[PDB]
Amino acid sequence: RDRIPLRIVRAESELSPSEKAYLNAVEKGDYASVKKSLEEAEIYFKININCIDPLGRTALLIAIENENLELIELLLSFNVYVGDALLHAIRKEVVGAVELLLNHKQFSEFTPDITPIILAAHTNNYEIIKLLVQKGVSVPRPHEVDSLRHSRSRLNIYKALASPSLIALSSEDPFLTAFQLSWELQELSKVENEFKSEYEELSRQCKQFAKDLLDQTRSSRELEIILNYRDDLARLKLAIKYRQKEFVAQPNCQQLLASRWYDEFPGWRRRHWAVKMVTCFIIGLLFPVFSVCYLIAPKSPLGLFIRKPFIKFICHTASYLTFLFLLLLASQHNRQGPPPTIVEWMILPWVLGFIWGEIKQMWDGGLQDYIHDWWNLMDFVMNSLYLATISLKIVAFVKYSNPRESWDMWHPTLVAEALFAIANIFSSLRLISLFTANSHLGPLQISLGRMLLDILKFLFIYCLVLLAFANGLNQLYFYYEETKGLSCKGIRCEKQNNAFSTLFETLQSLFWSIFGLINLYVTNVKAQHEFTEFVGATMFGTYNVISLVVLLNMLIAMMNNSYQLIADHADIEWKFARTKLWMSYFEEGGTLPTPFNVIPSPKSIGRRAADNLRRHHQYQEVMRNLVKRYVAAMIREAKTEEGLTEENVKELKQDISSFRFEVLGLLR
Amino acid sequence: LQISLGRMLLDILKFLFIYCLVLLAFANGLNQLYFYYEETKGLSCKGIRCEKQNNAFSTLFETLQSLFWSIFGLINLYVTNVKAQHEFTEFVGATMFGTYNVISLVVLLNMLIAMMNNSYQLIADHADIEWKFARTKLWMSYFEEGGTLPT
Amino acid sequence: YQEVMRNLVKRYVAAMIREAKTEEGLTEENVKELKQDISSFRFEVLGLLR
Amino acid sequence: RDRIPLRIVRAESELSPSEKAYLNAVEKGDYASVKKSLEEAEIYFKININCIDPLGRTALLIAIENENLELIELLLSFNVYVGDALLHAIRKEVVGAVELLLNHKQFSEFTPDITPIILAAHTNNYEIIKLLVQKGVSVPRPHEVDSLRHSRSRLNIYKALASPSLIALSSEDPFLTAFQLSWELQELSKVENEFKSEYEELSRQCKQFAKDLLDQTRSSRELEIILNYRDDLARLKLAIKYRQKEFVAQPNCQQLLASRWYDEFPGWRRRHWAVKMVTCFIIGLLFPVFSVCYLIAPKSPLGLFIRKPFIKFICHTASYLTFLFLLLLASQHNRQGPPPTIVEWMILPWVLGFIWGEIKQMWDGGLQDYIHDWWNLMDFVMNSLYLATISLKIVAFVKYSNPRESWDMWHPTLVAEALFAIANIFSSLRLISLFTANSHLGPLQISLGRMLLDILKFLFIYCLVLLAFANGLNQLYFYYEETKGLSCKGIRCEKQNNAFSTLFETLQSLFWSIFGLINLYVTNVKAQHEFTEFVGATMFGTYNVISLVVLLNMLIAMMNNSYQLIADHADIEWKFARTKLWMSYFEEGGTLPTPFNVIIGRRAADNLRRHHQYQEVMRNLVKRYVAAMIREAKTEEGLTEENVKELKQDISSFRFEVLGLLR
Amino acid sequence: TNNYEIIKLLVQKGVSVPRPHEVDSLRHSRSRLNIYKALASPSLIALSSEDPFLTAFQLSWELQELSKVENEFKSEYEELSRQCKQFAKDLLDQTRSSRELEIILNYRDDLARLKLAIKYRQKEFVA
Ligand SMILES: CCCCCCCCCCCCCCCC(=O)OC[C@H](COP(=O)(O)O)OC(=O)CCCCCCCCCCCCCCC
Ligand SMILES: CCCCCCCCCCCCCCCC(=O)OC[C@H](COP(=O)(O)O)OC(=O)CCCCCCCCCCCCCCC
Ligand SMILES: CCCCCCCCCCCCCCCC(=O)OC[C@H](COP(=O)(O)O)OC(=O)CCCCCCCCCCCCCCC
Ligand SMILES: CC(C)CCC[C@@H](C)[C@H]1CC[C@H]2[C@@H]3CC=C4C[C@@H](OC(=O)CCC(=O)O)CC[C@]4(C)[C@H]3CC[C@]12C
Ligand SMILES: CC(C)CCC[C@@H](C)[C@H]1CC[C@H]2[C@@H]3CC=C4C[C@@H](OC(=O)CCC(=O)O)CC[C@]4(C)[C@H]3CC[C@]12C
Ligand code: NA
Ligand code: NA
Incomplete structure (x- = not known):
């Protein structure tokens, strides 16, 4: 028509105008008119006490929403249908819920799973949670053997168990509850793709609660009571095990780890940086001097000097540096390859030292925690190529005796040298993992390592573009151009005669055509077919546009957004990996670096219950203090x-209106 | 503008130490693989800078020049040949040179772009008040006498 | 200089308190x-009228 | 020592504890204890009335800060030293300042330039400004013939004149006051490096005030009364003249400009886009048909057809496209050259049309507004190269008669062809300036055009790096090499023989070495000097690192921040340039595109009628605007x-009054 | 809490602060x-300082160079040094009249206070 008629489609019963006067009496704060209207309401005919608006509000709630406790005492003095009014008293943090606890299909506003203590924990009010635990209320356990309710x-x-007040109260120790709940909520967010941000939000809440209990630690003996509690530093090990990146890198905790990392050094972190370079240089030069000791006399000044973990790092990385300067020295110095040089003879205790060090590293921690970090996998590939290298040198020495350059092209000396060179690339890229100790080169390296996982998602797409244009250029060019009469037959050749002939040659041609290293005369046919040459060069041109312009700048944009998202959490992330680095040098069994790991390098009971009760009541005493001052801090x-x-x-x-209705009731 | 660039230089110089360790890495590899495989001293010109590029991975210093100049498009593929016939060492050497080009040109250099995007965003907030501080360091070096009558 | 700083500290403290x-x-x-401030006034007026 | 003592260094007098009881009688709202203590204060024994805290707090101010008007009436009933208390009544927007107006070295908190109406305008409260204008208060004019005060x-x-309430009140028309104040505050911010962001903030305030008066325009005849007020569309021409980029691109004004731009197309903007491409294609094909008319009969359907400005754009740009397809056709077709082909005989009315069009464009607007836009300067360079081209063709035809390739290398046919080709590059880059009409390609082109000025600041640094490494590589390679035997002698040759020989050759070598177009055998010496070859290649290497790794990615980062800062204002600033494009086709004298371009008391009655009509409309807009901002x-x-x-x-004074009535 | 009134109420009774330098670990x-954190507040420096520009400059220097010493608590000492560097600019903002500004910027205990401000890297005092 010309107009639209607006009618209430979903009908509401509404209430008798006298009932509207009764709900006008309440919410205005009338202690007189409500009492008069309820004494009238005893007579059944005039009005009903449990009257409900078309918009919620069944009498009792209005006395809670407009927070007035005298009307709650007046209505609970009478028989008002409470229903879910206790829950509405919980949401607003009204501590008049005492009056709904101590005393006394209908459109409940809440999902019927909600008990009072679940919604008490959601509001995170300490007082109401203490008021509900004192009566005794349980929570169901979550595990299972129609679907939205589940x-x-x-x-x-x-969401209720993760609140920091059912962990401050009602937990034996809130650090294990925060750590294990953050683990179960993180690994539970990985299970359900739906509801991912909510379980991640709850796990972030549990990870913030533990740091906010550390922040309440004064008097550093308490911090050691917390960080030594074995049910070493057992709590820190268990905190790093649960990826608590904010528990670690609290500024109180890093004081403990930094002083632990600097045993006898005095004001080491106050000296000049060049003096630090001189001390690290001459301690790094004397690494066989300190490590011949602790084999002669582990109860000695030099034997106790390498037991300090900052000196273990300079001895371990200094030994690794001399291994790398010796690999620099290897290339500056016969198919029957024997001890080719004195260099290799010097190398074998270092290589057996790294293999022993990685097997010894896999004897503790397991293959899950070992295979989680990527540098350990890189050590597995490195040392596997060292075993392949020395095995092919031995196998190359036996059963071979001498053409100069002519060889089998799979002769094991050549494969040994190639795998040795790849193992040198993987070996000398480990120095990057030494950056987390430094405070300037530290967070940079971990931000790049965090962007690598976003790059590796991108290169899949690029590999499918390579398979696409490789199928296309191979299909078009394996008939038209093929040369078998040529000398050098590859893209490498100075002439670049065949590029797209075969599929592997085409993959090399497109991959090297990312860079400016493959010229156009590649796409020419030895025959005279200008159509297939133009189609092939258009194919190669759109490859260069999609790869060079369309995708590579998308990779730049992706790393711009990812690096923006990383550098917010860079400092608290760097220090977690710095502790991971530091705390691998605290333990004994792990001193005496790689050439001295196995041999000197060749020249070529009621007291258990007493300590458990002691440590247990001591830790619960410290926790009592921290939970006390923490709850006071968050309430503040x-x-x-x-x-x-x-x-x-x-x-x-x-507050003003009820006082008006009372003073005007006393004056009139 | 000049002071914002001067501000980003200290974040670039933290970045190039990582790249120097990558140069040390792939230089150790390509030298170690190509010092025996190929040599040939019967060349008129003998380096990367020559018109034919005869020996590039032969010496460690020659390999550092070859990788550094291979950041740019200035070193061709026929560099990685062997004068002998060893297709396995040529392929492993070209794969090492390829992963050098991917790590240096596709991952490392765009990470440097991203780093300068975040650093330049953090600098240009405090750009106006830190330009004028250096402008008064420039101005206030000309207020005193004893420094007039230029060079 | 102490008179000038008396003026500046005076008007500065007035400025930050503003x-x-x-x-x-x-x-x-x-x-x-x-x-x-309403509740104590309630329990005083009700204490004077009752 | 072991401690540090803390003493009040800047000591002041401490008020007598009875005076502290008097200033505790105020700040609580006592209407009884203040009256008793002041009646006691008439006796000079116990308390002076004008008592001052060590922290401001004069007796009167406390009655203003804690906003209580009955204590202001009580203190002003007595003789309290007011001083600057009126100004403190202005800051808090207390409308009890009436009581400080109608009735009645000491540490003034305010700079002594501050009159009451200046600080009334700074607080932007309409009511207090109306209360101070009704008494009659003036502002000093700013112009001049010890330095912080000035x-x-x-x-x-x-800052007081730019407030939107001394422009809502006290202005003959607030659009000229907002426009001229935004101009004077912008061009005043350019004068003073210091205080730049504050005058730019005030000019942005004036530019927002005008858009917030256009938002109050209902009933579109009012919008035409505003946008036609000549003291055409004179107010939009004057708005574009003052760069009011938010006045224009109000959604109310763009309907007037869009309907003006679409005269007799009923709902053109509702049709399908391919149908729009067909109509623009066949109107763009019939450009000479509609433009032979308006020369035959300007009072005719086809003569009034081209007077519609959307059709002027398709005829002008369609004619320009056929000029460019004809330049495509020029290269698909003797020292003493003629007008050699039929193509250039066809070209000459097109070129004389653009020269006439640019001189005709410079007859109105002046060389300042003409030289402000960059595309007009590009037209100046384009048509200047057209004059140089046809002048060297006519000069080339006379006094020359025939070696086919062996020529002077400065022979005017070659210079005519080179300047003709450069003029074709400049001419066919004008199609980019056609993008502002389109809604998808529009804001993109203007965002790129706004990043160009940030690129041109960057390339001067790069030019100094070019002079640096060019001085180095020339200075090192001038001696060691100079192959003067080579058949081909430059970078552009197949062998690249001498690249760092001379300075201009070195500038070409470094500039082309930005790209991968210069090899490394360039840096050899024909002699055997490995040290100078290594130092030269290290200098060339650090040039490539500074230029390609540091300098160019800094340019990427700079354009990332600049494009982030631009795209917030990209849409509104697109529409300002779209109305600069649209509004150049509204006027007559400017139709008939390039090849067809050449070949009395009633005045006081209309001035009072338009003047009182416009003041009535502005009476309505200022009324509902002031109501809107106070809302x-x-x-x-x-x-x-x-x-x-x-x-x-408001609770405490009521407490000390009820307790005063019950006790 | 940076409240001027309560600080004036406690200085009038006479209360001292320990000096920070020394010859179990969290308390220290x-x-x-x-x-x-108490000395860097702009009300102990408005009161109880002979001149608050030297106190703001020298405290910003000791808090910056103290943040470089301790990698832990770095952002907190940098926050306090930024607070001291903002306080000095917020005292300049109160300088009305050219003559007063020259009394400040010429105070040798030339432009000695500007030279001493550039010496302590006060990038917001300048500009
Ligand atoms: C598809 C999944 C991946 C992501 C999606 C990619 C988006 C689609 C890519 C578009 C296709 C690429 C264009 C076609 C390639 C091509 O023409 O290449 C084919 C040939 C190139 O020369 P040949 O003909 O000799 O091969 O085109 C020509 O004949 C010459 C004229 C064409 C000019 C190309 C204009 C396109 C602009 C591309 C360059 C942009 C540079 C950016 C810097 C300003
Ligand atoms: C490690 C610390 C530094 C940072 C970490 C770097 C992350 C790991 C880098 C991954 C390794 C590089 C890939 C291997 C190189 C290689 O294959 O190079 C080795 C060769 C290249 O040709 P050759 O075999 O002739 O040498 O690979 C081939 O045989 C051809 C088929 C492989 C195709 C490569 C596909 C990978 C995609 C890389 C290009 C991405 C371009 C981006 C634009 C879209
Ligand atoms: C100065 C104002 C402009 C802005 C300031 C610029 C900052 C300073 C620039 C540093 C100087 C450049 C480095 C020196 C150039 C050079 O060595 O070039 C000189 C030569 C290059 O080869 P030649 O010796 O044959 O010339 O260096 C060598 O001999 C080879 C070994 C050096 C390896 C260079 C390692 C530096 C890393 C630079 C590449 C970064 C790539 C980024 C992607 C990951
Ligand atoms: C080929 C060999 C002979 C040298 C190749 C490596 C060195 C040239 C450089 C590259 C990386 C540098 C390392 C990078 C990071 C560190 C960590 C850093 O340790 C610290 O920060 C000390 C702890 C602290 O700072 O509290 C100082 C040494 C070290 C190993 C540097 C030692 C010197 C290294 C190995
Ligand atoms: C793709 C390459 C080959 C360029 C093609 C050459 C021309 C055919 C293209 C280049 C730019 C295009 C122009 C870019 C922008 C416009 C504005 C646009 O006009 C409008 O938006 C109509 C007004 C409206 O949309 O309300 C449509 C035509 C036009 C001139 C386009 C016409 C066709 C042009 C000239
Ligand atoms: Na390991
Ligand atoms: Na023009």
Whole structure:
């Protein structure tokens, strides 16, 4: 028509105008008119007590929303249907919920999984949670042997258990509850792609709660009581095990790890940086001097001097540097390859030292925690190529005796030299992993290492573009141009005669055509077919546009967004890996670096219950202090939020209005 | 503008030490693989800079020049041949040179672009107040007497 | 110089105490102040009328 | 020592504890204890009335800060030294300043340039400004024939004049006041390096005020009364003249300009885009048909057809496209050259049309507004190369008669062909300036054009790096090499024989070595000097690192920050240039594109009628605007603490009055 | 808390602060950071300082070079040094009249206060 008719499609019963006067009496703060209207309401005919608006509000709630406790005492003095009014008393953090605890299909606003203590934990109010635990309320355990209720109810249970007040109260130790809950919520967010950000939010909440308990640690003996609690530094090991990147790199914790890392050094971190370079240089030069000791006399000044973990790092990395200067020296110095040089004879204790060090590293931690870090996998590939290299040198020495250059092209000396060179690339890229100790080159290296996983998602797409244009240029050019009468037959050849002939040759031609290293005369046919040459050069041109312009600048943009997202969490991430580095040098069994790891390098009971009860009650005493001052601290921080909702004005408004209705009731 | 670039230089110089260790890495590899495989001293010109590029991976210093100039498009593929017939060492050497070009030109250099995107975003907030500090360091070196009558 | 700094510290302290007022954010404890400024007045007037 | 002592270094007098009881009688709202203590204060024994805290807090101010008007009436009933208390009544927007207006070296908190109406304009409260204009208060004019007071006082005067309530009140028309003040504050921010962001902030305030008056225009006849007010569309021409990029691209004004741009197309902007391409294609094909008319009969359907400005754009740009397809056709077709082909005989009316069009464009607007836009300068260079081309063709035809290739190397046919080709590059890059009409290719082109000025600041640094490494590589390679036997002698040759020989050759070698186009055998010496070859290749290497690894990625980062700063304002600043494109086709005298370009008391009655009509419309807009901003002052989603300081005394004074009536 | 009135109420009774330098470990660095956090407030420097520009400059220098010493608590001492560097600019902002500004920027205990400001890297005092 010309107009639209607006009618209430979903009908509401509404209420008798006398009932509207009763709900006008309440919420205005009338202690007189509500009492008069309820005494009238005893007579059944005039009005009903449990009257409900078309918009919620069944009488009792209005006395909670407009926070007035005398009307709650008046309505609970009568028989008002409570229903879910206790839960509405929990949301607003009204501590008049005592009056709903101590005393006394209908459109419940809440999902029916909600018990009072679940919604008490969601509001994170310490007082109401203490008021509900004192009566005794349980939570269901989450594990299982129609579908929205199950995942919603499990997320409400984990959302309730992850609150820092059912972990401050009702936990034997809140650090294990925060750590194990952060683990179960993280690994639970990986299970369900749906509800991913909510379980990640809860795991971030548990990871922040533990740092906010560390922040309350004064008097550093308490910090050692926390970080030594074995049910060494067992708590830190268990914190690094659960990836608690904010528990570690608390500034209190790094004081403990930094002093532990600097045993006898005095004000080492106060000296000049060039003096630090001189001390690290001359300690790095004397690494066989300190490590011949601890084999002669481990109870000695030099034997106790390498037991200090900052000196273990300079001895371990200094030994590794001399291994690398010796590999620099290897290339500056017969098919029957024997001891080719004195260099290799010097190399074998270092290589057996790294193989022993990686097997010894795999004897503790397991292949899961070993295979989690990428540098250990790089050590596996490196040392595997060292075993292949020395095995092909031995096998090359036996059963071979002498053409100069002519050889089998799979002669094991050549494969030994090639795998040796690849193992030198992988061996001398380990110095990058030495950057996490430095404070300037540290966070940079870990930000790049964090962008690598976003690059490797991108190169898949590029590999499918390579398979695409490789199929296309091979298919078009394996008939038209083929040369078998040529001398050098590859892209490498100075002439570049065949590029797209075969598929592997085409993959090399496109991969090298990322760079400016393959010329156009590549795409010419020895015959005279200008159509297939033009189609092939257009094929190669759109490859260069999609790869060089379309995708590589998308990779730049992707690393711009990823590096923006990384550098926020760079400092707290760097220090977690710096502790991982530091805390691998605290333990004994791990001193005496690689050439001295196995041999000197060749010239070529009621007291258990007493300590458990001692340490247990001591730790629970410290926890009692930390949970006390923590709950006081967060309650303090609840007050300061710099924002006032509209229901605070709703509280002041009735504070004035009920006082008006009472003074005017006493004056008239 | 000049002071924002001067501000980004200290973040570049932290970056080039990583690249120097990558140069040390692939230089150790390509020297170690190509010092025996090929040599040939019967050349009129004998380096990368020559018109034919005869020996590039032969010496460590020659390999450092070959990788550094292979950042740019200035070193051709026929560099990685062997005068003898060893297709395996030529392929492993060209794969090592290829992963050098991927790590240096595709991953390392665009990470440097991203790093200068974040650093230049962090600098240009405090650009106006830090330009004028250096402008008064320039101005206030001309207020005193004893420094007039130029060079 | 101490007279000039007397003037600057005077008008500076006045300026920052002026800027403490205009923060565009009220914490909840301000409502905790107004609520007791009504509540004590309630329990005093009701103490004088009863 | 072991401690550090803390003493009050800047000591002041401490008020007598009775005076502390008097200043504790105020700040609580006592209407009884203040009155008793002041009646006691008439006796000079116990308390002086004008008592001052060590922290401001004069007795009167506390009654203003804690906003209580009855204590202001009580203190002004007595003789309290007011001083600067009126100004403190202005800051808090207390409308009890009436009581300080109608009635009645000391540490003034304010700079002594501050009159009441300047600080009334800084607070932007309409009511207090109306209360001070009704008494009659003037502002000093800013112009001049010890130094902080002068620039601070001028910035307070311009800060007061730029407020949208001394422009809503006290201005004959607030659009000229907003436009001219935005101009004077922008061009005043360019004068003073210091205080740049503050005058730019005030000019942005004036530029927002005008758009916020156009937002109050309902009933589109009012919008035409505003946008036609000549003291055509004179107010939009004057708005584009003052770079009011937010006045233009209000959504109300772009409907007037869009409907003006579409005269007799009923709902053109609703059709399918391919149908739009067909209509623009066949109107673009019939350009000579519509433009032979308006020469035959300008009072005719086809003569009035080309007077519509959307059809002028398709005829002008379609004619320009056929000029460019004809330049494509020129290269697909004797020292003493003629007008050699039929092509250039066809070209000459096109070229004389553009020269006439640019001289005709320079007859109106002046060389300042003409030289402000860059495409007009590009037209100047293009048509200058056209004059040089045809002049060297005519000069080449006379006094020359025939070696086919062996020529002078400066022979005017070659210079004519080279300048003709450069003029074709410049001529066929004008199609990019056709992008502002399109809604998808529009804001992109203007964002790139706004990054160009940030690129050109960067290339001067790069030119100094070129002079640096060019001085080095020339200085090192001038001696060691100079192959003067080679058949081909430069970088462009097949062998690249001498590249760092001379300075110009070195500049070409480094510039082309930005790209991968110069090999390494360039840096050899014909002699055997490995040290100078290595130092030269290290200099060339550090040139490649500074230019390609540091300098060019810094340019990428710079364009990342600049493009982030541009794309916030990209859409509004696109539409300003789109109305600069649109509004150049509204006027007559400018039709008939390039090849067809050449070949009395009633005045006072209309001035009073338009003047009183426009003042009535502005009466309505200022009324509903002031109502709109006073509505928006209420909703700010933030309460300062002094609101709680108002409610707390509104309870406290009521307490000390009820307790005064019951006891 | 940076409240001027309560600080004036406590200085009038006479209260001292320990000096930070010395010849179990959380109390020492936490107590040191509370002492420097208290001395860096712009009301102990408005009161209880002979001249607050030298106190702001020298405290910004000791808090910056103290943040370089301790890698832990780095952002907190940098925050306090930024607070001291903002305080000096917020005292310049209160300079009305050219003559006063020259009294400040000529105070040798030339332009000695500008030279001493550039010496302490006060990039917001300058500009
Ligand atoms: C598809 C999944 C991957 C992501 C999607 C990619 C988006 C689609 C890519 C578009 C296809 C590439 C264009 C066609 C290639 C081509 O023409 O290459 C084919 C040939 C190139 O020369 P040949 O003909 O000799 O091969 O084109 C020509 O004949 C010459 C004229 C064409 C000019 C090309 C204009 C396109 C602009 C591309 C360069 C942009 C540079 C950016 C810097 C300003
Ligand atoms: C390690 C510390 C530094 C940072 C970490 C770097 C991350 C790991 C880098 C991955 C290794 C590089 C890939 C291997 C190189 C290689 O294959 O090079 C080795 C050869 C290249 O040709 P040759 O065999 O002739 O040498 O590979 C081939 O045989 C041809 C088929 C392989 C195709 C490569 C596909 C990988 C994609 C890389 C290009 C991406 C371009 C991006 C634009 C879209
Ligand atoms: C100065 C104002 C401009 C801005 C300031 C620029 C910052 C300073 C620039 C540093 C100087 C450049 C380095 C020296 C050039 C050079 O060595 O070039 C000189 C030569 C290059 O080969 P030649 O010796 O044959 O010339 O160096 C060598 O001999 C080979 C070994 C050096 C390896 C260079 C390692 C530096 C890393 C630079 C590449 C980074 C690539 C980034 C992608 C990962
Ligand atoms: C080929 C060999 C002979 C040398 C190749 C490596 C060296 C040239 C450089 C490259 C990386 C540098 C390393 C990078 C990082 C560190 C960590 C850094 O250790 C610290 O920061 C000390 C701990 C602290 O700072 O508290 C100083 C030494 C070291 C190993 C550097 C030692 C010198 C290295 C190995
Ligand atoms: C793709 C390469 C080969 C360039 C093609 C040459 C021309 C045919 C193209 C280049 C730019 C195009 C122009 C770019 C922008 C416009 C504006 C546009 O005009 C409008 O938007 C109509 C007004 C409106 O949309 O309200 C449509 C035509 C036109 C001139 C285009 C016409 C066709 C042009 C001249
Ligand atoms: Na390992
Ligand atoms: Na023009």
